[PDB]
Structure 1
Amino acid sequence: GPSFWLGNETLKVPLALFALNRQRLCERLRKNPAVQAGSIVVLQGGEETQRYCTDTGVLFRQESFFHWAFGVTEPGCYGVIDVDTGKSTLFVPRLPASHATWMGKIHSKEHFKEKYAVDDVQYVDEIASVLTSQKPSVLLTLRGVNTDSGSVCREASFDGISKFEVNNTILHPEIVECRVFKTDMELEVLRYTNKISSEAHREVMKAVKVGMKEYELESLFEHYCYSRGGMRHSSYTCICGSGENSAVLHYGHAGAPNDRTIQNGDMCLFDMGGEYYCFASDITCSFPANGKFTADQKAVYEAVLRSSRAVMGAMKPGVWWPDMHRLADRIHLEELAHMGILSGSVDAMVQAHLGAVFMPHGLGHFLGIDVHDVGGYPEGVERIDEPGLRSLRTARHLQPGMVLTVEPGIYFIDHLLDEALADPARASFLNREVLQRFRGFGGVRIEDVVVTDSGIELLTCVPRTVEEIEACMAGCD
Structure 2
Amino acid sequence: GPSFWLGNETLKVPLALFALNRQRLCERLRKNPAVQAGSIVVLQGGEETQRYCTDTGVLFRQESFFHWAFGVTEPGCYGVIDVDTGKSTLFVPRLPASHATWMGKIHSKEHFKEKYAVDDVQYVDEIASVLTSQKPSVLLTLRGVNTDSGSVCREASFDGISKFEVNNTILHPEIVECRVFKTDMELEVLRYTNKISSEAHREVMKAVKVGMKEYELESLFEHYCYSRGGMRHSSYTCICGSGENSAVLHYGHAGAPNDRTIQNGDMCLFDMDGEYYCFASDITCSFPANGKFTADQKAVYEAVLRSSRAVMGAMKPGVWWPDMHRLADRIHLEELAHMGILSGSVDAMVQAHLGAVFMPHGLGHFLGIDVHDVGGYPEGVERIDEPGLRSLRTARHLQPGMVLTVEPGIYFIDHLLDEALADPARASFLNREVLQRFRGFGGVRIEEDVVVTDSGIELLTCVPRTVEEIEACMAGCDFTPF
TM category (shorter chain) comes to: over 0.9
Report the Cα distance in structure 2 between the residues aligned to 1:453 and 1:339, rounded to whole angstroms. Answer: 37
Deviation per CA, 1:74-129: give whole Å up to 9, x if none.
00000000000000000000000000000000000000000000000000000000
Deviation per CA, 1:18-50: give whole Å up to 9, x if none.
000000000000000000000000000000000
Q: What percentage of aligned pairs have identical amino acids?
A: 100
Residue segments in structure 1 that go unaligned for 5+ positions in a row: none
- In the TM superposition, what are the counterparts of 1:455-470 in structure 2 within 5 Å? 455-470=456-471
Report the Cα distance in structure 2 between the residues aligned to 1:414 and 1:380, rounded to whole angstroms. Answer: 36
Tell me, what secondary structure is at the counterpart of 1:145? Answer: coil
Tell me, what secondary structure is at the counterpart of 2:265? Answer: coil
Which deviates more, 442-451 or 18-27? 442-451
1:284 alignment counterpart? 284
Q: Could you state the TM-score of these two structures normalised by the residue count of structure 2?
A: 0.98
> 1:454 offset after TM fit, Å?
1.5
> 1:451 offset after TM fit, Å?
3.9
Tell me, what secondary structure is at the counterpart of 2:404? Answer: strand
Contact kept in structure 2, 1:362 and 1:392, CA below 8 Å:
yes
Contact kept in structure 2, 1:322 and 1:389, CA below 8 Å:
yes
Q: Could you state the TM-score of these two structures normalised by the residue count of structure 1?
A: 0.99
Tell me, what secondary structure is at the counterpart of 2:90? Answer: strand
Tell me, what secondary structure is at the counterpart of 2:317? Answer: coil
Report the Cα distance in structure 1 between the residues aligned to 2:258 and 2:162, rounded to whole angstroms. Answer: 48
> 1:449 offset after TM fit, Å?
3.9
Contact kept in structure 1, 2:270 and 2:284, CA below 8 Å:
yes
Deviation per CA, 1:247-299: give whole Å up to 9, x if none.
00000000000000000000000001110000000100000000000000000
Report the Cα distance in structure 2 between the residues aligned to 1:453 and 1:31, rounded to whole angstroms. Answer: 24
Report the Cα distance in structure 1 between the residues aligned to 2:177 and 2:456, rounded to whole angstroms. Answer: 21
Contact kept in structure 2, 1:42 and 1:80, CA below 8 Å:
yes
Contact kept in structure 1, 2:235 and 2:281, CA below 8 Å:
yes
> 1:132 offset after TM fit, Å?
0.2
Report the Cα distance in structure 2 between the residues aligned to 1:268 and 1:169, rounded to whole angstroms. Answer: 45
Report the Cα distance in structure 2 between the residues aligned to 1:453 and 1:375, rounded to whole angstroms. Answer: 20
Distance 1:457 1:476, change over 3 A: farther
Report the Cα distance in structure 2 between the residues aligned to 1:207 and 1:475, rounded to whole angstroms. Answer: 10
Contact kept in structure 2, 1:280 and 1:367, CA below 8 Å:
yes
Contact kept in structure 2, 1:343 and 1:429, CA below 8 Å:
yes
Deviation per CA, 1:422-469: give whole Å up to 9, x if none.
000000000000000000000000044444441000000000000000
Report the Cα distance in structure 2 between the residues aligned to 1:142 and 1:183, rounded to whole angstroms. Answer: 22
Deviation per CA, 1:322-350: give whole Å up to 9, x if none.
00000000000000000000000000000
Report the Cα distance in structure 2 between the residues aligned to 1:115 and 1:192, rounded to whole angstroms. Answer: 22
Deviation per CA, 1:300-332: give whole Å up to 9, x if none.
000000000000000000000000000000000
Tell me, what secondary structure is at the counterpart of 1:404? Answer: strand
Report the Cα distance in structure 1 between the residues aligned to 2:303 and 2:451, rounded to whole angstroms. Answer: 20
Report the Cα distance in structure 2 between the residues aligned to 1:470 and 1:217, rounded to whole angstroms. Answer: 18
Tell me the matched-pair count: 477
Moved over 4 A (4+): none
When the two chains are superposed, the root-mean-square deviation of aligned CA atoms in Å is 0.7
1:201 alignment counterpart? 201
Contact kept in structure 2, 1:398 and 1:452, CA below 8 Å:
no
Contact kept in structure 1, 2:67 and 2:278, CA below 8 Å:
yes
Residue segments in structure 2 that go unaligned for 5+ positions in a row: none
Distance 1:448 1:133, change over 3 A: closer
Report the Cα distance in structure 2 between the residues aligned to 1:454 and 1:401, rounded to whole angstroms. Answer: 11
Report the Cα distance in structure 2 between the residues aligned to 1:176 and 1:104, rounded to whole angstroms. Answer: 35
Report the Cα distance in structure 1 between the residues aligned to 2:329 and 2:186, rounded to whole angstroms. Answer: 32
Contact kept in structure 1, 2:399 and 2:452, CA below 8 Å:
no
Deviation per CA, 1:175-221: give whole Å up to 9, x if none.
00000000000000000000000000000000000000000000000
Distance 1:122 1:178, change over 3 A: same
Report the Cα distance in structure 2 between the residues aligned to 1:349 and 1:337, rounded to whole angstroms. Answer: 10
> 1:476 offset after TM fit, Å?
5.4
Tell me, what secondary structure is at the counterpart of 1:332? Answer: helix
Report the Cα distance in structure 1 between the residues aligned to 2:195 and 2:86, rounded to whole angstroms. Answer: 34
> 1:154 offset after TM fit, Å?
1.4
Report the Cα distance in structure 1 between the residues aligned to 2:453 and 2:304, rounded to whole angstroms. Answer: 21
1:140 corresponds to 2:156? no
